[PDB]
């Protein structure tokens, strides 16, 4: 009866994946299974070009 998940809420495991994937191949790329394309915004809208 082993436990490889003694994982507490203090450390990062949810955030561990995010900043590592952004370094290899940029997250913006199109994918099938993976919802790879980033939960971002419009860079030309948040700063007004009015």
């Amino acid at each position: 009866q082993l436990n490889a998940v003694v994982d507490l809420q203090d450390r990062n495991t949810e955030l561990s994946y995010q900043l590592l994937l952004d370094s290899i191949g940029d997250r913006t790329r199109y994918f099938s299974m993976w919802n790879q394309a980033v939960d971002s915004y419009d860079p030309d809208v948040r700063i007004i070009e009015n």
């Binding site: 009866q1 082993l2 436990n3 490889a4 003694v6």
Partner: protein, 53 residues
Amino acid sequence: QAAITTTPRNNLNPRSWPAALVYQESPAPTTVVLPRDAQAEVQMTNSGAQLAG
């Protein structure tokens, strides 16, 4: 046949039997050392790391 392996008795039909030559089985003490080490576990768990082996 009444003297071949019988082992002749003190009284021809006794009451309470002893242990000699009535095949008292002695299976040898099964000796295993340790599944995990006690001395290797005390030093780590008190100072830092947690384990599951």
